[PDB]
Design a protein around this ligand. Structure first.
Ligand code: AR6
Length: 195
C-alpha cells in the first residue's frame, strides 16, 4: 500500500490518496461502487464479495428485497464479512451518459454526500472511511471529471461545517495507477500541495 497525497481538510479530518487494494485496506468503513440492484457482478463489488465472503451478497440481496433498489446517489450499508473493516457502504454512482452530463455529475455529488452523511451523522463512531472513484470504471464516468467532482464535494461538505463525529481520515483509493494519479491531481488542484 502506498500513500501519495495527504492534507488536513479541516482541523480534525485528513484527506489522503492511496494506491491499494480495497479488499485488504484496513479502515472502519469501505465504500463499494455498486449498482441499483446491489448485484456485485464485476469490478470492486465482485472483489469485495470474493474477499469478504458471499454473506455480503446475501445481505445486499435482502436489503433490496426489503427496501427496494438503491437509486444513483443513494447508499445501503451492510456488514463486511471477513474484510478488515466493520461495514461496507454500498454507494450507487451514475452510469455515464454523454447527453446528461449535468444529471450524472449531480448523482455522483449526491452519492458522496450520502456517504458523508452516514459517516458523520448516522454512525458517529466511524474514524476512517475509504472511498473509490465511483462510476469511473465499468460505469465509464470520465476519470478527471469524476475525481474532481468527488474531491470538491468532500471539501464543500466538510470545510467550515461543525459536526459531532469521530471521523479523522478519508482515504481515496484505487488499485490502478491512472486513477491514483487522477485523485492526486484533483486533490492538489482543489486543496493544494501534499502536507
Ligand atoms: N480491489 C480494488 N481495490 C481498489 N480499487 C479498486 C478495486 N477494484 C476496483 N477498483 C477501483 O474501483 C473504482 C470503481 O470501479 P468499478 O468497480 O468499475 O465501479 P463503477 O462505479 O465504475 O461501476 C459499478 C458497476 O461495476 C460493477 O459491476 C458493479 O456491480 C456495478 O454494476 C475504479 O477506480 C477502480 O479502479
Amino acid at each position: 500500500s502506498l500513500q501519495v497525497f495527504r492534507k488536513m481538510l479541516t482541523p480534525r479530518i485528513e484527506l489522503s490518496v492511496w494506491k491499494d487494494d480495497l479488499t485488504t485496506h484496513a479502515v472502519d468503513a469501505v465504500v463499494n461502487a455498486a449498482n441499483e440492484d446491489l448485484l456485485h457482478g464485476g469490478g470492486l463489488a465482485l472483489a469485495l464479495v470474493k474477499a469478504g465472503g458471499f454473506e455480503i451478497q446475501e445481505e445486499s440481496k435482502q436489503f433490496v428485497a426489503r427496501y427496494g433498489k438503491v437509486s444513483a446517489g443513494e447508499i445501503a450499508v451492510t456488514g463486511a464479512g471477513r474484510l478488515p473493516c466493520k461495514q461496507i457502504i454500498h454507494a450507487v454512482g451514475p452510469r455515464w451518459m454523454e447527453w446528461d452530463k449535468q444529471g450524472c455529475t449531480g448523482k455522483l455529488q449526491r452519492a458522496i454526500v450520502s456517504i458523508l452523511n452516514y459517516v458523520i451523522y448516522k454512525n458517529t463512531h466511524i474514524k476512517t472511511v475509504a472511498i473509490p472513484a465511483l462510476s469511473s470504471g465499468i460505469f465509464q464516468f470520465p476519470l478527471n471529471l469524476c475525481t474532481k467532482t468527488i474531491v470538491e464535494t468532500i471539501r464543500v461538505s466538510l470545510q467550515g461545517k461543525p459536526m459531532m463525529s469521530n471521523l479523522k481520515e478519508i482515504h481515496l483509493v484505487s488499485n490502478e495507477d491512472p486513477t491514483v494519479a487522477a485523485f492526486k491531481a484533483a486533490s492538489e488542484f482543489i486543496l493544494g500541495k501534499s502536507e
